[PDB]
Write a protein that binds this ligand. Structure first.
Ligand code: MET
Length: 237
């Protein structure tokens, strides 16, 4: 028009997650008269940078381990505003339906950022594919492997490249953020799935100096409404 409405920029991930954010934005307008503008991203390392730089007022795409790690490596100054959902990561495959009877020497693809790499290795261990040292935490790496019976080779790739990895490796642990973009769900296609209970619940994060504002708080509330939840269930099969 000739003048625009006052809006708040929320950063989210393209695809399934943006669809969920769309409903939240819908609920935010009806309940709080909060006009929201979704800003979709395709890479995990961008959202916090945008938030910190002032390009967006908040984002919804990460879990605490990831945020803490990124704040430590770049010094962003952010504060958690509220929890969203948990997306139990899963291992998928266009070749096998089970982990037992996985040929020896196979390649297994996993994300390469530190917190999701560690998460994947922990998950593999739960499958009995490998064993990690006793004191390893949430940041395990290949240097922490103390047992590898099937002689597996861990291929670390950028999270957004894991979908396409299914065509080159025996099995890939993919964030639902991307697995959904190729119509895969843990419940329907997962060879194995991470437990619901874990430290990976997603969050709505804002800057340290704006987290108190009702704009941030209200969006958080809208995202936790029954409506959005219902829409989310649908969106993820
Ligand atoms: C940047 S960490 C992102 C986590 C991802 N959405 C998951 O829940 O698997």
């Amino acid at each position: 028009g000739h003048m625009d409405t006052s809006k708040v920029k929320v950063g989210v991930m393209a695809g399934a997650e943006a669809q969920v954010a769309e409903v939240a934005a819908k609920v935010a307008k009806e309940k709080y008269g909060l006009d929201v503008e979704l800003v979709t991203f395709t890479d995990y390392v961008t959202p916090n940078a945008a938030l910190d730089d002032g390009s967006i007022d908040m984002n919804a795409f990460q879990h605490k381990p990831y945020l803490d790690r990124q704040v430590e490596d770049r010094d962003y100054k952010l504060t958690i505003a509220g929890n969203t959902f948990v997306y139990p990561i899963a291992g998928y495959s266009k070749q096998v339906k089970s982990v037992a009877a996985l040929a020896d020497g196979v390649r297994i693809a996993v994300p390469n950022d530190p917190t999701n790499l560690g998460r994947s290795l922990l998950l593999l261990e739960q499958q009995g594919l490998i064993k990690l040292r006793p004191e390893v935490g949430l940041l395990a790496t290949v240097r922490d492997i103390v047992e590898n019976p099937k002689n597996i080779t861990i291929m670390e790739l950028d999270a957004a490249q894991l979908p396409r990895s299914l065509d080159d490796v025996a099995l890939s642990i993919i964030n639902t953020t991307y697995a959904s973009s190729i119509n895969l769900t843990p419940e329907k296609d997962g060879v194995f799935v991470e437990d619901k209970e874990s430290p990976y619940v997603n969050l709505i994060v804002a800057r340290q100096d704006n987290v108190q504002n009702e704009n941030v708080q209200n969006f958080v509330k809208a995202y936790q409404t029954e409506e959005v939840y219902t829409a989310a269930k649908e969106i993820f099969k």
